[PDB]
Amino acid sequence: HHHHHMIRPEYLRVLRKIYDRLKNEKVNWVVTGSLSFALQGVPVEVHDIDIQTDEEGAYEIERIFSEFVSKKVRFSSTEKICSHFGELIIDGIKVEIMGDIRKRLEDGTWEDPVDLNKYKRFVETHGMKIPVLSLEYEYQAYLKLGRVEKAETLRKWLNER
Template sequence: MLPQKHLNVLQKIYNKLKETNINWVITGSTAFIIQGIPLVPSDIDIQTDIKKYKKYISFNDMQLPVLDLEYEYEAYMKMGRVEKAMLLKEWVCKIKKLEVKGRTRD
């Protein structure tokens, strides 16, 4: 869950950037929380100019840009942060299983 102080700052960032041409995404633990991973964030990480891996998540009445979790997994592996990378990989696999279960045959 995202602490209220983080949510307040995120709302300010979102309100300032949503109507601009700035290409931005939220990364790190805050992005993971927005995408459903249960963590406690220490900060809000933002990157710019990463269009290829950018996607939007609905969160608290905002459409927030985040990096794709598979891209984040690869980045964390390259940084040697294996524990966080494994958390991301497990979450991606869980999401994919849910997506497959939710599909019906035509």
């Protein structure tokens, strides 16, 4: 953990609550977003918890954490990214559930969702074996989001004309 950076205990507490209910379920899930970076030693503050999973996993997670569901899992799509998307709030912390995230391809097709198991690693942390997507994958994913943002920004700037 570069910089001996520590994840704020509120996030670890909620992560434990999530881990405890998923650990012995057949759910294909990973922590993604900032918490995945942090768990893998990148000193970044976490503000919410992102769980990426497959389509079935999103609905299973929602059911497992039914009392915490703030937004029902629904297939949700922009023109760029879609997923089976819902939200939990646990102890005031937002948990984004994203099942089978797919990115739009140049041709308008949707990429197949990632094989989470190609990139999943288990981080031993605070007595928990937490599945995360690899830093390499995460970095590449954010850089890709970045490209999308840049293209959209340029389009919007031009649209203002």
